Each structure stands twice: as structure tokens, then as C-alpha cells.
Swiss-Prot record, chain A:
Phosphorylated by casein kinase 2 (CK2). Phosphorylation by PKC probably decreases the membrane binding and tubulation capacities of PACSIN2, thereby modulating the lifetime of caveolae. The F-BAR domain forms a coiled coil and mediates membrane-binding and membrane tubulation. Autoinhibition of these functions is mediated by an interaction between the SH3 and F-BAR domains. The F-Bar domain also mediates the binding to the cell actin cytoskeleton through the interaction with CAV-1. (Microbial infection) The SH3 domain is required for the cell-to-cell spreading of HIV-1 virions. One of its GO terms (molecular function) is cytoskeletal protein binding. This is Protein kinase C and casein kinase substrate in neurons protein 2. It is found in: Cytoplasm; Cytoplasm, Cytoskeleton; Cytoplasmic vesicle membrane; Cell projection, Ruffle membrane. One of its GO terms (biological process) is plasma membrane tubulation. Keywords: Acetylation, Cell junction, Cell membrane, Cell projection, Coiled coil, Cytoplasm, Cytoplasmic vesicle, Cytoskeleton, Endocytosis, Endosome, Lipid-binding, Membrane, Phosphoprotein, SH3 domain. Residues 10-259 form a coiled coil. Widely expressed. It comes from the Eukaryota. It is a peripheral membrane protein. The lineage of its organism: Eukaryota, Metazoa, Chordata, Craniata, Vertebrata. Belongs to the PACSIN family.
Amino acid sequence: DSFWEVGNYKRTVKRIDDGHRLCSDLMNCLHERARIEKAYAQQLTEWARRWRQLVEKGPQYGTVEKAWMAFMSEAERVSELHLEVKASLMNDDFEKIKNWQKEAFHKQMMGGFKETKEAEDGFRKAQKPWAKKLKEVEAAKKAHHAACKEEKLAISREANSKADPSLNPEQLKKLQDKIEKCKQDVLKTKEKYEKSLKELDQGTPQYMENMEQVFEQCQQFEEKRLRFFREVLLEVQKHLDLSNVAGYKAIYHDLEQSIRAADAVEDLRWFRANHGPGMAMNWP
Amino acid sequence: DSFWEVGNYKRTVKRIDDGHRLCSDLMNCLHERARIEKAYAQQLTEWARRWRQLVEKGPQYGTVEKAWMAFMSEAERVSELHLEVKASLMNDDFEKIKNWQKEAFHKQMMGGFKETKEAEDGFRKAQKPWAKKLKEVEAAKKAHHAACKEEKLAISREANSKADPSLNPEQLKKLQDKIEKCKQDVLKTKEKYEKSLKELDQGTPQYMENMEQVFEQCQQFEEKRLRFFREVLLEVQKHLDLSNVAGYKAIYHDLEQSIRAADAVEDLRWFRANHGPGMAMNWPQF
Ligand SMILES: [Ca+2]
Ligand SMILES: [Ca+2]
């Protein structure tokens, strides 16, 4: 139930297998994000190339045709931005974790992680002396718990056979022979059965110190990882961050200007000269 | 090829049908943009849900578990903003163009549009006066070229008949008059050809005046469409713009602070107390 109970250091021992687990999960978490960002960028440039072409082949010409293209252009600037969001998540963040994992966890041959294995052995050693004494102590209490269960059997047995009618010449003595024999046990077994509980307590302050020394080490190894995680997530939020960006705002004040540059009357002047009454005519 | 040659005004008339198409094209262009916005927003939320589950059912607990989770949140917050872009494009800009195209163009029962048909007729009535005249000159150029063609024929024929001897005496008077009428036609048809040439130049000034009045009418209609596109495009640029949004900065406002709220020392202190030496023990007794 508790850490100090034999073999319960395991909960923290498992805590490092998970460390390697979570590194991979964090890596995939980000990996899927990058993938999502890339798709939005693929869809962006396709829509842009699709419609840049459709507008150019279409009937729209002149200055309004331009404002419209500025539109596809923004789909392309926005595409390049999310393309870099992805590039950053994979080239910087993802890799940073992949490399930390390789430096913090070393897959063994048999085999698990050289690190989890070392925590196991360190705990096992700390407990070893204490578990053996418990091994002795548990024999102490259980043997006597059968020794006391063995005084009561004859005390309530004798008065029971005392009321009995027959055979009291020598059969009397044996009745008084096997209740007092159990008397030497309850004193002899208990005497040592509670002596082991002594030795255990002498060899207890060390066991507690040899288990906090292994533990604080496991803690130190987790602390490094936790700090890493917080540090990396900080850099990730910065790579996803598009709320306050220079290049981003340029995309949109450029767009606005380009559309504002659209001159309806200018475009009309052009159509009059090149397809209308402005055209030259060879009069008979 | 020039606009002034008959039936060439059709280029500007064709412009009216094209205006209607372009309204449809812009409509479709924006729709596919809005659908892209939706797909991205959607992916972002499929993702957020998937990983909120995985981190919660996973081994990671404490403040770091949270910093990691405020992360699925930012994906959900970004997602919503792009659904806003999608919404604005379809509810405002798409509907806007859709309605304008319904009050600018009316579909005749027979075909085409009321405005396309209206302009074409306007160009015919403006041209008919001059069209009938060019038709007359068009013949004069031919009949005269036929008279000059037939003329050099008769002369060549008497000249080709200059060396060739009899027969005959009566055959000549025939080949003698053939030429006279020919030298007559070139002086006659030339007269009619000259007459129509000037007969047109007196009906030509009134031809351009009417052609212009119909043209400005088409410009008047094209101007509204062109000015409208400018208007709508500015409204889309505004809707597409996420580079300066309060609700957007706020996302990383809270992400950064939810991440910085992470604390290794605290998480470890919780673990030892709840899973380690901090735990009290049922120390053995008699
Ligand atoms: Ca074009
Ligand atoms: Ca969890």
C-alpha cells in the first residue's frame, strides 16, 4: 500500500519508463501539429494557383484584375508562414526532444533502460537487509501466533476433559502435562519472536536513509525532464505564435493597398481605347 | 477589327454577360477559400480533442500536464477564429455578391439577359442608318470594279481583234459599241460610287453620336460592377485579416502563462508525499 512497504519503490521505478514514453508522445503531439500546418499550406497554394490561373484566363482585366490577384498572393504569404511554423516545430522543437531522449534514456540489450535498471538495483540493495529481517520477524510472530493458539487449546481442553467421567488415575496427569508445556513455548518463542522486532528496529534508521538516497536520485532524474518539458513547450508556443508578427501584418497592409489601387474609371478609359469608340477606324 | 466596323460593338455587349459570370467566379473563389478555412479549423479541433485525451489518460500529471493541456486549448481557440473567417466570407461577402448579381442582371424568358439584349438593340438602332449606306457603297465598289473589269475586256477584245482579219464587217460594229458603253460605265458608275461616298459622310457624324450615347450607357453599367468588386474585396481582406486581433493575441497571452505556471519542484514534492518517502508506514509491532 505504501512506499516503505516491501517492493513498493516500484511506483517510482516505473516513473522513468514513462519519462521515455512521454518524450515520444510529446514528439508525436508536435509531429501531428506540423502535419496539420503543412496541409493548410498545401490547400492554400493550390487554391491560389487554381484561382490565379482562373482569373487570368477569365474576362477580368486591367486594374481590378490585379486587386484580385493580390488576394491569391496573400494565400501564398500565409502559406509560407504556416510552412515555417511546421519547419520550426520539426527542425527545432521535435529534434530537440528526440536528442534529449537519446541522451537521457539508453535502451539496453536484454532489456529495458540502463537507467530504470539502475534504480531497481539501488532500491533492492537498500531494502535487502530490511526485508531479510522482516523475513525473520514474520516467522517470529506467526510461529508464536500458533504457540498461543496452542496454549488456549489445552486450557479450555482440560476443564472440558475434567468434567468427563472416566480415566483419571494417570490420564489426569497428562492433562496437566500438556498445558504447562505450552507455557514454556509462549515464553520461549515470544521472547525471541519479539527479539527479532528489536534487531529490525536497530537496522531501520539506515534502511530509511538508504531509500531516500536512491529516491532523491530518481527525483533528480525526473526534475531534469520536467524542466526540459516546460522549457521546450515555451519554445513551441513561440513557434505557433502568429498573433503578433511583423511579416504577418505586412501581408495584409500590402493586400489592402493593392485593392485600393483599383481604379474603376482608369480601367474604363482603357476599354474605350482598345475595344471602343477610342479605336481607330478606316473610313471609306 | 475596329469597334466602328458593323457588328464589332458586340465586344462591349459581350462584356455584360461576362460581368455576370465574374460575379459567379468571385462567389466560387471565396467559397473554396471559406472551405479551406473550415478544414483547417476542423483539423485543429480533431487534434485538440485527440491529445487532450492522450495527455489526461497518460503518465504525465501535475503542472506540466496542464501546461501541455493549455496547448490543446490554443488549438481550439485558433480553430474558432478560422471558423469566424469562414463564417464572414459566406454570410457577408458571398451573400453580398450573390444579391448584387440578382438586382443587376435579370434573365429574359427567351435567353440571355434583359440588359444584354437591351444594349444590342441599342447598338443596332444606332447603326442601322449608317449600315444601309455602307451597303450601297459596298455595291458601288463592286459594280464599278465590274464595269472597269468588263471595260478592259471589250478593249482587249477589239485590240485582240486589231490584227486578226475577217470575218467580219458586221461583227465589228458590235465589238465597236461594246467599248463605247464601257468607257461610259466607268464615267457613270464612278458617279454613283462618288455620290454614296459623300452621302455617307453626311450620315456619319450622326452615326458616332448615337454609337457613343449607347457606349457610355454600357460604361455606366460596367462602372457599378467594377466599383462593387473593389468594395467587396476590401471587405474580404478585412475578414481574412488575423494579423491584429485582440482575441488572437489573448491565445498566446494565456498559453505562455499557462506554460510558465509549470513547476518541477512542486510536482516532485507532491510525488514523494503521495508516492514516496513522504508516505508514512505501518511500522511492525507485536
Ligand atoms: Ca484575365
Ligand atoms: Ca495524465
